[PDB]
Amino acid sequence: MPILLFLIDTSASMNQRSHLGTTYLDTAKGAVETFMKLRARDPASRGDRYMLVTFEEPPYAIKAGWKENHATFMNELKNLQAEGLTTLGQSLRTAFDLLNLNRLVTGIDNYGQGRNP
Amino acid sequence: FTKELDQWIEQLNECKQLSESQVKSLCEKAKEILTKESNVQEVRCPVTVCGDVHGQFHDLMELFRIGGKSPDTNYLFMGDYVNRGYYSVETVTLLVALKVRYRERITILRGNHESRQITQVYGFYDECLRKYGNANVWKYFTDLFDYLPLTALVDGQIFCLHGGLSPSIDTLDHIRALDRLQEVPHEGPMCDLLWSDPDDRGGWGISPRGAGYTFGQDISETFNHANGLTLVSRAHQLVMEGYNWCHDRNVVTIFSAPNYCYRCGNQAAIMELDDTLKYSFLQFDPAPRR
Amino acid sequence: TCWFEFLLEESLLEKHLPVQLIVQFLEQASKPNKRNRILKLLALKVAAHLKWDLDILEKSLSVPVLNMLLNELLCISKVKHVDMDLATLPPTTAMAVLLYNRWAIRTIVQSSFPVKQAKPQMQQEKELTENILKVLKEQAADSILVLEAALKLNKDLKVKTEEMQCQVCYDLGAAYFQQGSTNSAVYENAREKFFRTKELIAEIGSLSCTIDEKRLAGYCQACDVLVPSLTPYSQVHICLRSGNYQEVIQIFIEDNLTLSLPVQFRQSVLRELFKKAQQGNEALDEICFKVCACNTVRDILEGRTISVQFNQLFLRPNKEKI
Amino acid sequence: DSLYPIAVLIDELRNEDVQLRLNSIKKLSTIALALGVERTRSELLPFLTDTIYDEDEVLLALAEQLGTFTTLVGGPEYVHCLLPPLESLATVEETVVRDKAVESLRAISHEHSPSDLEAHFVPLVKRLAGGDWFTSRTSACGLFSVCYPRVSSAVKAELRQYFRNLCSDDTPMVRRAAASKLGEFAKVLELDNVKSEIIPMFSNLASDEQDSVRLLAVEACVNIAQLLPQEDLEALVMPTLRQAAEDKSWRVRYMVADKFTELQKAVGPEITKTDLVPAFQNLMKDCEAEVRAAASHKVKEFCENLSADCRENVIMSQILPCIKELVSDANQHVKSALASVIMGLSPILGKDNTIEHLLPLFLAQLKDECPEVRLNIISNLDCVNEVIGIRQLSQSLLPAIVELAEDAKWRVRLAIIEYMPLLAGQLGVEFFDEKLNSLCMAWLVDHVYAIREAATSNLKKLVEKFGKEWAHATIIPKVLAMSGDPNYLHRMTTLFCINVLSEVCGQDITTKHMLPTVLRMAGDPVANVRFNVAKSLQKIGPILDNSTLQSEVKPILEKLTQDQDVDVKYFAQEALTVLS
Amino acid sequence: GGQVASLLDTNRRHIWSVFHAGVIGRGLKPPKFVQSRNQQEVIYNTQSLLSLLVHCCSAPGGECWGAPILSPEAAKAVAVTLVESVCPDAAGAELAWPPEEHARATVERDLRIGRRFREQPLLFELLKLVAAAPPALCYCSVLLRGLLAALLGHWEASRHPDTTHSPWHLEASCTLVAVMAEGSLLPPALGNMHEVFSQLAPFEVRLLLLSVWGFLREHGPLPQKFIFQSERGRFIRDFSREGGGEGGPHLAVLHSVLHRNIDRLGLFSGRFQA
Amino acid sequence: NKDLKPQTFRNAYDIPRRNLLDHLTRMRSNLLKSQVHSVPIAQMGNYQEYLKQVPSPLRELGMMIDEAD
Ligand SMILES: [Mn+2]
Ligand SMILES: [Mn+2]
């Protein structure tokens, strides 16, 4: 049951083209698609759940969190617009906070009681 | 030296295939006619645009009864006259004969199934083999498919092509500069031109198919604005309703095959551009069969 | 019928309204032996039915197929051809060796030519063609010497010696012409050979072997231009070779009157004259100005733009220039 | 090895690609022609008897080639030598291969002489019947029919016994094959022998637990419903008939209903009435749509062949409530099946019975959601209009007809279109003019081309029927209005209208109305319009006056000949040649 | 010579149904653009402009005899501003030519350059003005490369047997080769191939232009290769010192093309002598 | 107004002057007794849902994707 968070850059610098003729955001979407295709080769891949975070404002940064099916992830991934700043730090903090959202409530981090691998 | 061609057209309307020598002469005439056509074939405004047929011959006759009989009605077929049907040979022969007889009154564009590999796999080759006991007719037809124009251009506004756009293509001059007389490659300009689809997407994307790209609304908007095109007619994808506008009325997918393998149950439709580009879609259901 | 059908019935040879049969037999034999011998004999018989029209076989049949056919003919009929010689032999072996060497040099010349690009088993055929062409290039000198020696001899299903000599010397001239791109003496030899070919054709005055008349005329014109040992174009070329430039001007004025020479040729000779003037003799300034003025006047008459060279040559103008 | 042509050549061809093997199969005749006939049989046929591993494609062609040996094998004395290799191929597991095998076997058996046929094929028939492989018995099933009308009595009886033993086989494929081939077998057998041998165990076969075997048993049953004498036919068929009709398996009941008409026609009127009136009503009252649709299709043929004395009574008593309940069925397909021939009963029932019972059913059908239903019901208005009279239909179905004329499906619209000549013939000019004339004009502007050409032909019919000055007062102004349309297809509808009308519109009317209209259309920018004008002038050429013909048509056709478009050139030249 | 009431009438046209579902885009296209001017006036306007340019470029003074020399600095300025105007000078702007793989990878810029050359005939005149001064044409390497790539694409795509069915492309290929020869970017042997372009089939002329591309790959239009001949104050390209200046493989290709069509090209064989 | 879905029939302010008469005729004819075909691309050729919605018929007796399996 792993988690795969794709922190796709949506800064306007991702509109740069390459010799492919597509923008960097297009190649990022294709990279996620091909990562899914390669991952699906393994039998264990049926248990993963994907997450999507972008370089937007906090109320809109997360667009595929928990309780989001695969179809919603794909639909959100297709309709990504590279139009923000390269606010890497704030978005990375949002991603880490999203991942650590459920840790305390389920008490997986045994604070003051040793670390359990 | 044309009464035999009208006799062939009359014969084909009854779904009776021609002999090998007749097909050879027809392919020769068509090659001598198609070579004088640019990759972007200019088409006068009054024309009935029709999507895929895929060898569903009785449905092609249904389409003719809907839109009228050529040469009284101008037509424009955007590829896929073969495969996924039990009467591919009759359909393609009738279309090529109409092209030879009435070259001004009908335009046939290359599809993504107009390829040697696709015909070998998807059963046009098998149909030719059964109906003629050899591969000679299949060879003659697949040689002809290299000469079919990639796209069309109705009145300088409507851009008709089988597939979608390409990341490396952003001008009609680029399409005009292509060397169409070859097999459909596994990549590059014309492969994407024949295999790409639109999508509710931003930017480009790898197609679910094995070739081409998926282009979003912004792509079609930029292409249309750059090339002075109002609409990009397309026919590569199935449509249950028969036709379907896309990308804020920048792209319309037209499917002219009622059913697709005689099992999908989809409706069909054909666009009818009049003398002033006042469009109109005429949907129809599959014709009754025995 | 087909390859197996014709094996047992011996009546389709004179009835069918041939190259298809030859390639079918060759392909059937190519599959990895009484049947092989029978197929080869049938192939040779049908090949002889066309009277060994080597152009038809060369263009229709492939290179390895015809190579195998000629090798099989050599094996059945006879057996370092240069050491062999012995023209006083049966006519069958003589014509077989002559045809093989003719095919060798013609294939060399044809492989030298360019072919339209291969836009799309074919790989194996291409590899076989490459290997055969390489080995043919290896022993080209032996083959051409054998053909020349055979052509020299005049001591002849035998055919007229005149037609055989005309065809073999035409092929010799073509081989030298291809060879002569990097040697002018070979071009002189080719010119002599083509003049001999033309003399033989004139002498016999035949109309039944097959020689491309247009190609022969082109070869004769090319040899005359390269090694003359008439028309204003050739006159300008000869004068440029020698240096009688005033005659070039007078021909150019006549050309302005008649509008005969290509515009491209005149611009090219103007360019090379300008190159020589900018490199060497100072007296070439006036000759360059004069030919440039001729070219400018022709361009004006034809309705084309005035050259930049004329414009710079009419800075600081003089009485004589105007 | 290589010296000998046949074996080595065919083996190497087999080693080649499969299409080359197919080419070799057609080549089999040539090797037979080249080699001696005795060489051909004695050498090749043992090789053809075994070592076959090409089940996919070449076997059907091989069987066909073996069936073509008219004289290549030499004659019947060698056709029986040709028999064993077909037997070897008859055991092929692929079904179509066996089908072509038994086809070739039947052909050569016909080619055989009588004594040769018995003495050679009968051991083969026993061997295939007695073979360990069920495939051999399924192949053997076909051959039992061909030997019978030429072989002697004792071998006839032995053949019948062997077929009867074959039907007892445990594997259901063998019984299926026997049942399928039972029809022709019983057809050629003698009636007393048919009864005594087949009918007990044929009824046993009909009672078999395998549903497919029961379907094919029903096929055999309807096949053999005409050879027995009447009383024995009753005693031997009716228990089996009702058993099959009320069978549990829905497929069996569907097959019983599908083949009902010929079963009915073959076993007499009164017997069918008495012992099938409950079963037939049961078939239409079943719980599955397939058998109900089949029965609904067969209703009209079932009714029309009954004895006329009590036909109306049995119809009105049994069938009519069932049809009434059937019209309201949820499944649309059964309604479409019923709608095809529901109104065929109207001549049989009578005027008053149709008006009372059948008219509300017709009105319900016309207002049904399923377009297939609407297509089927409209397709036979001729008979009901003929037997009911124009007055009752006009009072009753005319608004429904008009509502149907506005339907989405163009096929429905053209179905409505075809009856305008029929309605016109039986109705006055004034009422049609004030009710349907504008409706007729409405079809001319329809999107679908089929509708427009149908309306054009109907306009021809109306003008030849309702006179000429009436068309000038009603039809011609709308056509002229259509001539000014911007869309070109409406102008082409106008030109087709000119074509059809001008033949029966009278010379003076045709010229003085159409010719100013047709001539102005010649300057249209669309090339389609120009070449259609040329074609129209060619067609309506001989029918108009000659001075006007020359003076008007000739200059504009001369103009069109030099027009740039190729089609306009060709059609103008053709028109000039036609006019001469 | 360069290139380049509604509602009321609608009610008049309008039986009581729309029939057509709508108008595709903004209705009918316009009556298209037209142009017309006397070609004599175009020629002499171009002559006036080119005479002014030659006056501005030629160095002052002096002596009583000798035609003036076009200044390579002024012609370099004209070259670089031409490059800026026509194309964006965006990528692959180094003077060294790349492989033909790059020619297939930048077809859009090449087509833009080709269309600019086709619409504006004045560009070729300015090109040969630049080519009059030897070193300056090297700085138009991007322009020449793009135009040559466009012509190669056209000749590959062409299907006619004769090369005269494409009039502008034939003329452009001839002019392009002649201009490259004028600027000493090609040897005299390669420089004469435009004389024979009018006779060949499309694939042969494509092969010759590809040979030109290969030669420019091998040697290149590098201004450092031009040696300043102080004897007359002019730069001169020495191909004999360059090594393989005659272009061995390229002359082999040209000889093969000539030999194939020797019937029509016999007289032109002397133009390609050493 | 992105994703506005202008109710042209319902509101008269959404009719451009460019095509006022044609839409007037269409809404008039629609109003008497006598947005679609803009489905998303994903739901454009999903034949499974369309067939499931439609009534069932009579019971039954190189590149990778090219649609309809
Ligand atoms: Mn397609
Ligand atoms: Mn398709």
PDB file of N, CA, C and O in Angstrom, chain E residues 6-31:
ATOM      1  N   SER E   6     -26.676  43.755 -43.280  1.00  0.00           N
ATOM      2  CA  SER E   6     -26.612  42.335 -42.941  1.00  0.00           C
ATOM      3  C   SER E   6     -27.985  41.770 -42.593  1.00  0.00           C
ATOM      4  O   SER E   6     -28.479  40.844 -43.250  1.00  0.00           O
ATOM      5  N   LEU E   7     -28.606  42.315 -41.542  1.00  0.00           N
ATOM      6  CA  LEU E   7     -29.891  41.818 -41.055  1.00  0.00           C
ATOM      7  C   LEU E   7     -30.980  41.961 -42.111  1.00  0.00           C
ATOM      8  O   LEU E   7     -31.792  41.047 -42.298  1.00  0.00           O
ATOM      9  N   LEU E   8     -31.016  43.104 -42.803  1.00  0.00           N
ATOM     10  CA  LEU E   8     -32.061  43.354 -43.792  1.00  0.00           C
ATOM     11  C   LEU E   8     -31.962  42.376 -44.956  1.00  0.00           C
ATOM     12  O   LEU E   8     -32.965  41.773 -45.352  1.00  0.00           O
ATOM     13  N   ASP E   9     -30.757  42.199 -45.509  1.00  0.00           N
ATOM     14  CA  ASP E   9     -30.560  41.262 -46.615  1.00  0.00           C
ATOM     15  C   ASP E   9     -30.859  39.838 -46.158  1.00  0.00           C
ATOM     16  O   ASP E   9     -31.408  39.031 -46.921  1.00  0.00           O
ATOM     17  N   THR E  10     -30.490  39.513 -44.914  1.00  0.00           N
ATOM     18  CA  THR E  10     -30.775  38.190 -44.367  1.00  0.00           C
ATOM     19  C   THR E  10     -32.277  37.950 -44.310  1.00  0.00           C
ATOM     20  O   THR E  10     -32.754  36.855 -44.634  1.00  0.00           O
ATOM     21  N   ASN E  11     -33.039  38.966 -43.893  1.00  0.00           N
ATOM     22  CA  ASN E  11     -34.494  38.849 -43.892  1.00  0.00           C
ATOM     23  C   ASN E  11     -35.033  38.724 -45.311  1.00  0.00           C
ATOM     24  O   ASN E  11     -36.031  38.033 -45.538  1.00  0.00           O
ATOM     25  N   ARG E  12     -34.400  39.409 -46.270  1.00  0.00           N
ATOM     26  CA  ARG E  12     -34.800  39.291 -47.673  1.00  0.00           C
ATOM     27  C   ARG E  12     -34.659  37.858 -48.167  1.00  0.00           C
ATOM     28  O   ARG E  12     -35.551  37.331 -48.842  1.00  0.00           O
ATOM     29  N   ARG E  13     -33.521  37.226 -47.863  1.00  0.00           N
ATOM     30  CA  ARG E  13     -33.285  35.855 -48.306  1.00  0.00           C
ATOM     31  C   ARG E  13     -34.277  34.886 -47.673  1.00  0.00           C
ATOM     32  O   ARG E  13     -34.808  33.999 -48.352  1.00  0.00           O
ATOM     33  N   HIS E  14     -34.531  35.033 -46.376  1.00  0.00           N
ATOM     34  CA  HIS E  14     -35.427  34.138 -45.651  1.00  0.00           C
ATOM     35  C   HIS E  14     -36.874  34.297 -46.114  1.00  0.00           C
ATOM     36  O   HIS E  14     -37.595  33.314 -46.278  1.00  0.00           O
ATOM     37  N   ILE E  15     -39.123  26.772 -45.636  1.00  0.00           N
ATOM     38  CA  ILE E  15     -39.392  28.202 -45.698  1.00  0.00           C
ATOM     39  C   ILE E  15     -39.338  28.810 -44.302  1.00  0.00           C
ATOM     40  O   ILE E  15     -38.492  29.658 -44.017  1.00  0.00           O
ATOM     41  N   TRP E  16     -40.244  28.367 -43.430  1.00  0.00           N
ATOM     42  CA  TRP E  16     -40.312  28.854 -42.059  1.00  0.00           C
ATOM     43  C   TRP E  16     -39.467  28.019 -41.102  1.00  0.00           C
ATOM     44  O   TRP E  16     -39.720  28.025 -39.892  1.00  0.00           O
ATOM     45  N   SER E  17     -38.452  27.327 -41.615  1.00  0.00           N
ATOM     46  CA  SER E  17     -37.490  26.614 -40.793  1.00  0.00           C
ATOM     47  C   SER E  17     -36.084  27.001 -41.223  1.00  0.00           C
ATOM     48  O   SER E  17     -35.842  27.343 -42.384  1.00  0.00           O
ATOM     49  N   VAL E  18     -35.160  26.960 -40.259  1.00  0.00           N
ATOM     50  CA  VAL E  18     -33.788  27.405 -40.491  1.00  0.00           C
ATOM     51  C   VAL E  18     -33.059  26.511 -41.484  1.00  0.00           C
ATOM     52  O   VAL E  18     -32.117  26.966 -42.146  1.00  0.00           O
ATOM     53  N   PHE E  19     -33.436  25.225 -41.559  1.00  0.00           N
ATOM     54  CA  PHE E  19     -32.797  24.198 -42.385  1.00  0.00           C
ATOM     55  C   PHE E  19     -31.361  23.976 -41.918  1.00  0.00           C
ATOM     56  O   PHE E  19     -31.047  22.928 -41.346  1.00  0.00           O
ATOM     57  N   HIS E  20     -30.486  24.948 -42.155  1.00  0.00           N
ATOM     58  CA  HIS E  20     -29.103  24.844 -41.718  1.00  0.00           C
ATOM     59  C   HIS E  20     -29.005  25.170 -40.232  1.00  0.00           C
ATOM     60  O   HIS E  20     -29.673  26.079 -39.733  1.00  0.00           O
ATOM     61  N   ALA E  21     -28.173  24.406 -39.523  1.00  0.00           N
ATOM     62  CA  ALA E  21     -28.053  24.547 -38.077  1.00  0.00           C
ATOM     63  C   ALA E  21     -27.274  25.786 -37.662  1.00  0.00           C
ATOM     64  O   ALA E  21     -27.356  26.190 -36.497  1.00  0.00           O
ATOM     65  N   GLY E  22     -26.528  26.390 -38.570  1.00  0.00           N
ATOM     66  CA  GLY E  22     -25.767  27.578 -38.247  1.00  0.00           C
ATOM     67  C   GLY E  22     -24.729  27.841 -39.314  1.00  0.00           C
ATOM     68  O   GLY E  22     -24.596  27.095 -40.280  1.00  0.00           O
ATOM     69  N   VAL E  23     -23.995  28.930 -39.114  1.00  0.00           N
ATOM     70  CA  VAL E  23     -22.933  29.343 -40.024  1.00  0.00           C
ATOM     71  C   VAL E  23     -21.595  28.962 -39.412  1.00  0.00           C
ATOM     72  O   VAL E  23     -21.310  29.306 -38.257  1.00  0.00           O
ATOM     73  N   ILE E  24     -20.777  28.249 -40.178  1.00  0.00           N
ATOM     74  CA  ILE E  24     -19.461  27.829 -39.713  1.00  0.00           C
ATOM     75  C   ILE E  24     -18.526  29.030 -39.753  1.00  0.00           C
ATOM     76  O   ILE E  24     -18.243  29.575 -40.825  1.00  0.00           O
ATOM     77  N   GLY E  25     -18.035  29.435 -38.581  1.00  0.00           N
ATOM     78  CA  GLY E  25     -17.152  30.578 -38.478  1.00  0.00           C
ATOM     79  C   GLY E  25     -17.835  31.884 -38.851  1.00  0.00           C
ATOM     80  O   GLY E  25     -19.048  32.056 -38.700  1.00  0.00           O
ATOM     81  N   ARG E  26     -17.034  32.819 -39.350  1.00  0.00           N
ATOM     82  CA  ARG E  26     -17.528  34.133 -39.760  1.00  0.00           C
ATOM     83  C   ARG E  26     -17.961  34.151 -41.223  1.00  0.00           C
ATOM     84  O   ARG E  26     -17.542  35.010 -41.998  1.00  0.00           O
ATOM     85  N   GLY E  27     -18.826  33.207 -41.601  1.00  0.00           N
ATOM     86  CA  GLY E  27     -19.399  33.193 -42.935  1.00  0.00           C
ATOM     87  C   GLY E  27     -18.378  32.941 -44.035  1.00  0.00           C
ATOM     88  O   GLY E  27     -17.345  32.294 -43.835  1.00  0.00           O
ATOM     89  N   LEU E  28     -18.693  33.456 -45.221  1.00  0.00           N
ATOM     90  CA  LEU E  28     -17.870  33.243 -46.404  1.00  0.00           C
ATOM     91  C   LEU E  28     -16.527  33.956 -46.269  1.00  0.00           C
ATOM     92  O   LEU E  28     -16.411  34.998 -45.619  1.00  0.00           O
ATOM     93  N   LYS E  29     -15.505  33.372 -46.893  1.00  0.00           N
ATOM     94  CA  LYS E  29     -14.194  33.990 -46.950  1.00  0.00           C
ATOM     95  C   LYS E  29     -14.244  35.206 -47.881  1.00  0.00           C
ATOM     96  O   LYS E  29     -15.145  35.311 -48.715  1.00  0.00           O
ATOM     97  N   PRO E  30     -13.304  36.151 -47.751  1.00  0.00           N
ATOM     98  CA  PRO E  30     -13.375  37.376 -48.572  1.00  0.00           C
ATOM     99  C   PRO E  30     -13.103  37.084 -50.042  1.00  0.00           C
ATOM    100  O   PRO E  30     -12.812  35.933 -50.404  1.00  0.00           O
ATOM    101  N   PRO E  31     -13.150  38.107 -50.946  1.00  0.00           N
ATOM    102  CA  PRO E  31     -12.856  37.825 -52.364  1.00  0.00           C
ATOM    103  C   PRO E  31     -11.388  37.590 -52.700  1.00  0.00           C
ATOM    104  O   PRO E  31     -11.034  37.654 -53.884  1.00  0.00           O
TER     105      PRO E  31
END
